[PDB]
Design a protein around this motif. Structure first.
Motif, PDB file in Angstrom:
ATOM      1  N   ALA C 243      36.320 -35.011 -26.757  1.00 30.11           N
ATOM      2  CA  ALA C 243      35.816 -35.854 -25.678  1.00 30.11           C
ATOM      3  C   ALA C 243      36.727 -35.938 -24.447  1.00 30.11           C
ATOM      4  O   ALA C 243      36.194 -35.863 -23.336  1.00 30.11           O
ATOM      5  CB  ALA C 243      35.491 -37.256 -26.210  1.00 30.11           C
ATOM      6  N   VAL C 247      35.372 -34.224 -20.687  1.00 33.29           N
ATOM      7  CA  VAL C 247      35.316 -35.203 -19.607  1.00 33.29           C
ATOM      8  C   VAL C 247      36.449 -34.959 -18.623  1.00 33.29           C
ATOM      9  O   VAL C 247      36.232 -34.906 -17.408  1.00 33.29           O
ATOM     10  CB  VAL C 247      35.347 -36.639 -20.160  1.00 33.29           C
ATOM     11  N   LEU C 292      29.266 -32.593 -15.178  1.00 30.20           N
ATOM     12  CA  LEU C 292      29.660 -33.788 -15.904  1.00 30.20           C
ATOM     13  C   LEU C 292      28.455 -34.625 -16.306  1.00 30.20           C
ATOM     14  O   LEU C 292      28.508 -35.336 -17.313  1.00 30.20           O
ATOM     15  CB  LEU C 292      30.635 -34.611 -15.059  1.00 30.20           C
ATOM     16  N   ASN C 299      26.752 -36.597 -24.784  1.00 30.05           N
ATOM     17  CA  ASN C 299      27.440 -37.692 -25.452  1.00 30.05           C
ATOM     18  C   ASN C 299      26.521 -38.873 -25.739  1.00 30.05           C
ATOM     19  O   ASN C 299      26.881 -39.740 -26.539  1.00 30.05           O
ATOM     20  CB  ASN C 299      28.618 -38.140 -24.592  1.00 30.05           C
ATOM     21  N   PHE C 300      25.350 -38.933 -25.112  1.00 30.26           N
ATOM     22  CA  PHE C 300      24.378 -39.970 -25.421  1.00 30.26           C
ATOM     23  C   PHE C 300      23.447 -39.574 -26.551  1.00 30.26           C
ATOM     24  O   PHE C 300      23.044 -40.433 -27.341  1.00 30.26           O
ATOM     25  CB  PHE C 300      23.553 -40.308 -24.178  1.00 30.26           C
ATOM     26  N   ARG C 303      25.377 -39.206 -30.097  1.00 25.71           N
ATOM     27  CA  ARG C 303      25.810 -40.473 -30.664  1.00 25.71           C
ATOM     28  C   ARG C 303      24.649 -41.303 -31.189  1.00 25.71           C
ATOM     29  O   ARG C 303      24.838 -42.480 -31.503  1.00 25.71           O
ATOM     30  CB  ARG C 303      26.597 -41.275 -29.626  1.00 25.71           C
TER      31      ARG C 303
ATOM     32  N   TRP E 237      27.547 -44.337 -20.164  1.00 23.70           N
ATOM     33  CA  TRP E 237      26.805 -43.460 -21.051  1.00 23.70           C
ATOM     34  C   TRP E 237      27.727 -42.667 -21.967  1.00 23.70           C
ATOM     35  O   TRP E 237      27.270 -41.753 -22.655  1.00 23.70           O
ATOM     36  CB  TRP E 237      25.927 -42.525 -20.223  1.00 23.70           C
ATOM     37  N   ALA E 245      38.301 -41.085 -22.582  1.00 27.26           N
ATOM     38  CA  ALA E 245      37.198 -40.626 -21.748  1.00 27.26           C
ATOM     39  C   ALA E 245      36.756 -41.707 -20.773  1.00 27.26           C
ATOM     40  O   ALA E 245      36.608 -41.446 -19.574  1.00 27.26           O
ATOM     41  CB  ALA E 245      36.027 -40.181 -22.622  1.00 27.26           C
TER      42      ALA E 245
END
Ligand SMILES: *[C@@H]1O[C@H](CO)[C@@H](O[C@@H]2O[C@H](CO)[C@@H](O)[C@H](O)[C@H]2NC(C)=O)[C@H](O)[C@H]1NC(C)=O
Ligand SMILES: *[C@@H]1O[C@H](CO)[C@@H](O[C@@H]2O[C@H](CO)[C@@H](O)[C@H](O)[C@H]2NC(C)=O)[C@H](O)[C@H]1NC(C)=O
Ligand SMILES: *[C@@H]1O[C@H](CO)[C@@H](O[C@@H]2O[C@H](CO)[C@@H](O)[C@H](O)[C@H]2NC(C)=O)[C@H](O)[C@H]1NC(C)=O
Ligand SMILES: *[C@@H]1O[C@H](CO)[C@@H](O[C@@H]2O[C@H](CO)[C@@H](O)[C@H](O)[C@H]2NC(C)=O)[C@H](O)[C@H]1NC(C)=O
Ligand SMILES: *[C@@H]1O[C@H](CO)[C@@H](O[C@@H]2O[C@H](CO)[C@@H](O)[C@H](O)[C@H]2NC(C)=O)[C@H](O)[C@H]1NC(C)=O
Lengths: 344, 344, 344, 344, 344
Positions: C243, C247, C292, C299-300, C303, E237, E245
């Motif tokens: 992560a 990012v 990005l 990442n949404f 998860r 998000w 991050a």
């Protein structure tokens, strides 16, 4: 009696044979002009351009025996600056002019007076932008000597000789201070007689010593570069398993020192030799570049695979030494650095 | 005898028929003016503007047979600079002036003397801002040739001819050094005779060779760009599982090299062709851009999913090669780079 | 015979009734002055100031029938530049001067000669800083047309008419090159006759076409902005669980493109309309801003909480598409960008 | 009657014996010139150069008894500015000129009128670039006093005396505001009589008080440096196990404060002493440098190895204190800082 | 008949009693000079210096009854610019000059013609650098009014009166555009009559309205500051457990907005009051400073220690609100911001 502007017309007219194109004591001994200056303003010492602007009163004194009078009773005759094109004046100039001009506001700022024995004082106000070479081998710790020299352009040594007067040849105004420098009270007055293919010409000069001020360069460059070195030292008190903590500290400090060194030479000439601020910003760059090379030895030995509990104890040993070693080496460098640029 | 300022009035007056608008040897052979300069100051070589400021003494010698005298006993007559508007002088100018001016402080800095056989010396002090084109194909490793050329504006080749004298046609002052350059002692003296639709005009010129100084550009650009390349090499000694350590090193070094390259051309003309500092900052950018592409091959192969212990051993193989390969390729580039810009 | 400076005094004196305040052919047809220039230097084209400095030889030819001679045998009489205040000369000026000056070093750089039939040539050296508007709709890909125009200030069209000569109305010096531009060989010569409330005045002008050089702006702006877009593309080859790696790459590239765009307009006028370098630095900013936003979709979805193995396979699907999609969209943008600014 | 330009020719001619080279009341009491200025423009106060440009009307009044008339009926005679070279005028100059010039557009901007009793008013327009030393011990909170002084160059105290008039010796234009300063209404008018080796010369001067404006330096420097200190305070509310979060915050804030301090002195002279903005940017640098030293105490104690649950509770104790301590120390510093630079 | 240069000598000579030092209608009504200008160039509006350079044709018309002729048959007599020092001309000047000069290249750019009834037209070309105060309370959204005013220096209101002519008192050239501004067609023409201690003097002035161009400041400042605010919105998000991050995004965006605000005032005067670009860069700084304060509330509540599953659900609640709240507050700020600086 007749007024002095009319008496002095009879001393410069066609009667009595005065001629402004002929030096005094012609076909005889040379003319002894004695000079002194008075520095009103000083400064704007540009170091890229290698020049400095000054504002002086140039006083000249010589003796013209054709101007000796005895009929008029008083002791001095001020000549008006409109009528200065009618007597003989020396052809002084500056061998390092780089541009200069007169001051002509509300009156030509000129002055001339004649004594009874023919002594002629002649004071004028000049602004000069004088050239001087900059020796920058030890740049914040140097004493810059910038000079000014006063030659004759058309009369040789057997016709006209310049001298400094023995009574205060360079005066400086009272409240004349400089932002970056100080002006030392001793001023070297020596001769600079030139030889060309034309003839040999007279020359006198005056040296000015300009010691800098340490206090500016400590605030901008020495102290913030010294904090980034300490900022790399706190890597050793961070856990070895925190890999982006010790690397992420070592990345940023080694590249801000490149920024602090690139801004260290922003307002300088592009000299080839290395100067005393450049040997600071390179050794201080060497400490923060070795603070990340220390973890490259940690992260290589602690990843070796009892073989586990051995190399972790060995990588612990390199951190206990480097918490004592690196501030000890930087301390003995500051001893060798500041003593070297104080003995010189 | 009568003084020389009055003797020389009879040599320029209405009697004897002297006229300052007529060249010597009129309706005859051309006038042979012989010239030499004396460089007092030199420098402020701006490369964006492509010019350089100089400060010279321009000496000119010709022969006016109308000024030959024999009654007056001595051998030279200095003419006063107020009376220079009354004899013939050549109309020399500079074909690449870009602005110029006289020096007129405390006296017009002019000089003229006349021998018995009519030889006229005429020396003046001029400040020039001369234009010169900058060849920057190999920018820190170049020899810049900037010239100055002296033409006639109104007299053609059949009336007036310029020559350099054979006895030291360009002298340079003793302590004349430059901050960024050195001035080579050999000066090319050649002819530059112009042809227009008006006529053909005389011209002489002098080349000056200005080799740079390597030492400045090593400190600011070559050495700090060489450290960031080494700063990317310490990624290979960091564990592969430390993902923000190897990426976070590769992010920062590849974007400080863009900063070091943007500041590499801050004080330059915007030339189209690529120069030798631009082929350094692009190859050094290629190494730090490939140091992050190496981990993109590591992080893709080591995440493949014995199939586990195979690709980790393969991603270990690409790191053992790249610890030997990348300093070996950068070493053989420095061999091919510095030899190429030393043989030229 | 008497010399030409004395013959030409009788042609300008009180005898023969010559008057320097009256144009030739007075109370008759207008005066036909024919002009041509000779560009010595060119350049320093400042775009913030929107001007350019030039250095020309302005030649003018007219016919004064009061200067026709037949007694003196030769065919041309050069008038001395001290005596140019005594014949009639046209009152030419430049309608876009923005400051200009003469060259007066060692002689007034002026020239005048008179033929037997009264033809008067008059050449002078002028330095101009001419104003020109800059059309910057396609800034590295433009052809800038900067002009210069030559008017009459006091004589109207029924008294004085300017023309270009048909034999080379604008010559350019041989080695005249520019650092940022090239000068096209075709020069548009047209009329620009002005109308005021005073009268109508003559005017001639000459257009100069200045195509730029692509090679500078590729090195500083196009290529480094193209590498940062590729630097965002290597995020997709990094593991999703790392992560701070994906990012931390997307943070830095999207904010160096803001730095590269802020430095893209450092030396420009503050024009309102959008130019071709601004539509490059905004689309290239859009790719690194979407690189990005792609991980914000990763990442949404990854998860979300078989429900576990579904959305990880869906977030794997958005990465396999974006490794093919984003270099394909940037490739078809470069096709639509460079063809659009080559067809124009 | 005859017109005033012809009446005033008989008052300045060879008849009546008027001479422009002789002061009024010659061989008698000195000349009492009374002066006042009128500031049209003010500003461009450069602090690196330590000068300021002003634009004044210099009015001078004296009494010449040789200009008293009674035949002509009216009460004032305006002398034309072409004929100002024919009466006596004082040789006033400025002892801190640093360059100055006249305004000569469409007419020499000069003015002279003569009353019946010989009172002569003489007003001229002058642009000055006056030098003044800058005391910057408390730089945004200072009151800068920059002066201007009016001396005599050729007449001593026993010949010519300057005075300010008692009726408004310095007027200021109505809409004269400054961008960075305000000009206080009280103006100190005192004497500055000089002593040289020549004689003693008259001098009058006027002090101008320039209080700054606080509002600019709050926006650029005080407020953004105060936010970065608060930006380091949010480290204490982040978990201790998040090692790149608390370190990565402490790295960036301590090196942006070095950037904010390097830009704090971009437009200043390089003074040695420490100023009030430098003691702000060093104490605010001390808080963000101690915010990373706090975690170096956390990360060393929390890694000690019940011995586990003890030191974690001790490292929790150092975080509960520092959430209260560091905003309390920064609050009591702002009390001691702003009161110190308000009482002075 | 005799030519006009000789006829006009008899109209200015000692015969007929013409005197250039005496105004027309002397000892009578005042002189009514009527004026109009013609703006050739406009621009270089520096806002730090608060001035602007213009290039005009100043036309003046008055009536001299001493110049009425009837013998010469034609209707206008152009006076040569060498002979302009021999008739009466008004002493116009500019009350906000800040330096100005004439154009003297190839001829003094002057013009004068005399009708049969004595009407005298007098047109000259002047370059001015006029001072104007800058009201910057709403800096990209302002209408700057910069004026120019034309006074009399030596003649009072009972001697000389300036007026604008009723037929186009200010003309502007056709292709006169500005890079940063537009010039509105309505020009306010009013009186500015001055009162001094000398007398009262005539004055006329002309206001120029300069509305800016929005399009530049949107590209450099408004749009990139609006993207960094959106760049902080993608923190919400990202998973809460990814601690470097969400922090590493919040660190960088809050310190690039300090960079974007420091560059927002690089080319401005240092005004004290807050301007409309400063209230944008402070509110946009407030959003990115609160985007990191949101995670400080997340990381404190989610670390509290069913007590575990409660506060994680509460820290989930603060993220679901802030994904809706923060773009909703920034949207209603843009409504209140752009309407406020459109209604004004
Ligand atoms: C100018 O200064 C020099 C030095 O005082 C004088 O030259 C010497 O004068 C003395 C006595 O007059 C002689 O003994 C020397 O022979 C001179 N020459 C040298 C080289 O010392 C000179 O007399 C002075 N000239 C005038 C007009 O004052
Ligand atoms: C100026 O210089 C040139 C070269 O010395 C001279 O021109 C030649 O002079 C010689 C002898 O006088 C002749 O044989 C040649 O025919 C000349 N011309 C050429 C092209 O060589 C010239 O005489 C000199 N003029 C003066 C006044 O000295
Ligand atoms: C100046 O140039 C113009 C064009 O050559 C001349 O004006 C014309 O001259 C011819 C013959 O002289 C006439 O047929 C025309 O009527 C003229 N006017 C126009 C508008 O064409 C003019 O003669 C020339 N003047 C001088 C002194 O040479
Ligand atoms: C110039 O000003 C001063 C001061 O007013 C005058 O000098 C004094 O004048 C009074 C009376 O005339 C004398 O009692 C004093 O002795 C004078 N000297 C001093 C030092 O006070 C002077 O008279 C004025 N001169 C003129 C021409 O007006
Ligand atoms: C200059 O302009 C003004 C206004 O036209 C004139 O002054 C007035 O002229 C009229 C008639 O001549 C009188 O009734 C007024 O009494 C005048 N004064 C005022 C204040 O209005 C003046 O005559 C003109 N002067 C010249 C020479 O033309």
């Amino acid at each position: 009696p007749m007024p002095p502007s009319e008496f002095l017309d009879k001393l410069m007219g066609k009667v009595s044979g005065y001629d402004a194109r002929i030096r005094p004591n012609f076909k005889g001994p040379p003319v002894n002009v004695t000079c002194n200056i008075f520095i009103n303003s000083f400064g704007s010492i540009a170091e890229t351009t290698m020049d400095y602007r000054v504002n002086i009163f140039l006083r000249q004194q010589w003796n013209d025996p054709r101007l000796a009078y005895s009929e008029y009773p008083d002791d001095s005759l001020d000549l008006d600056p409109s009528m200065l094109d009618s007597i003989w004046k020396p052809d002084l100039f500056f061998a390092n002019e780089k541009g200069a001009n007169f001051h002509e506001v509300t009156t030509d700022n000129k002055l001339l007076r004649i004594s009874k024995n023919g002594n002629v004082l002649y004071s004028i106000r000049i602004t000069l932008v004088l050239a001087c070479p900059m020796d920058l081998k030890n740049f914040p710790m140097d004493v810059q000597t910038c000079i000014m020299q006063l030659e004759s352009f058309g009369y040789t040594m057997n016709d006209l000789i310049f001298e400094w007067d023995e009574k205060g040849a360079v005066q400086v105004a009272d409240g004349l201070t400089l932002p970056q420098f100080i002006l030392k009270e001793e001023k070297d007055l020596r001769y600079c007689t030139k030889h060309y293919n034309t003839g040999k010409f007279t020359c006198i000069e005056a040296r000015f010593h300009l010691e800098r001020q340490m206090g500016y360069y400590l605030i901008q460059m020495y102290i913030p570069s010294l904090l980034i070195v300490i900022l790399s030292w706190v890597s050793f008190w961070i856990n070895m398993d925190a890999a982006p903590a010790r690397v992420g500290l070592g990345i940023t400090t080694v590249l801000t020192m490149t920024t602090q060194s690139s801004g260290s030479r922003a307002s300088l000439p592009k000299v080839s030799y290395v100067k005393a601020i450049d040997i600071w910003m390179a050794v201080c760059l060497l400490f923060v570049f070795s603070a990340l090379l220390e973890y490259a030895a940690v992260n290589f030995i602690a990843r070796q695979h009892e073989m586990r509990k051995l190399f972790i104890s060995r990588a612990k040993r390199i951190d206990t030494v480097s918490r004592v070693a690196f501030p000890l080496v930087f301390l003995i460098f500051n001893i060798f650095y500041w003593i070297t640029y104080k003995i010189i």
